[PDB]
């Protein structure tokens, strides 16, 4: 239904990147009206500045040079009940490195009861020249190869031992 998956923390210069922000409401059958706001604090800077605000199926982009013409919407479409607030970067530059905040303002409609809640998600993005391969993949691949090698040498040694023993037994008879 809805799974909250964290964003990738590494983007490569010159290509595209998607920043993931998923905010699933606690019960799926409830009806809500959601809008989101994104703030970004670049490396070497302290103040979070607003970069975009998505509401009513339209994206409002702030007048920022580092994001003008470079951000498109990648979240939930065709509804006011947004559970995916992701954005998409078309041309990653070194100015997109820093910390992002994904403010989710969800208004839930109940029987004679309106609840205005809010969620904040923080994403750290580092812009690099080349895609650094994950440690998990490298370690798992190396471990797989060494495990296969160990198993095959163990089996080979056991076969040679048994073959020598049975050949000696045959020669005895």
């Amino acid at each position: 239904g809805c799974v909250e998956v964290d964003s990738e923390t590494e983007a490569v210069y010159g290509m595209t990147f998607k920043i993931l922000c998923i905010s699933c409401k606690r019960r799926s059958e409830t009806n809500a009206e959601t809008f989101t706001e994104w703030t970004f604090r670049q490396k070497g800077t302290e103040e979070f500045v607003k970069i975009l605000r998505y509401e009513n199926e339209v994206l409002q982009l702030e007048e920022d040079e580092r994001f003008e013409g470079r951000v498109v919407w990648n979240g939930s479409r065709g509804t006011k009940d947004l559970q995916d607030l992701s954005i998409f970067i078309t041309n990653v530059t070194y100015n997109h490195s820093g910390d992002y905040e994904c403010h989710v303002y969800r208004l839930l409609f109940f029987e004679n009861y309106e609840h205005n809640t809010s969620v904040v998600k923080k994403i750290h993005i580092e812009v690099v020249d080349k895609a650094n391969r994950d440690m998990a993949s490298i370690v798992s691949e190396i471990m797989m190869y060494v495990l296969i090698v160990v198993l095959t040498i163990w089996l080979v040694a056991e076969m040679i031992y048994c073959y020598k023993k049975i050949a000696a037994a045959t020669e005895t008879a």
Partner: peptide
């Protein structure tokens, strides 16, 4: 399960373990 995307490391480990299991059963 549907939460396998929250467990990237376990996902990669399980892929490589599946390769190892296939090798073992072929042998």
């Amino acid at each position: 399960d549907i939460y396998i995307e929250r467990k990237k490391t376990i996902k990669i480990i399980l892929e490589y373990a599946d390769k190892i299991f296939t090798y073992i059963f072929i042998l």
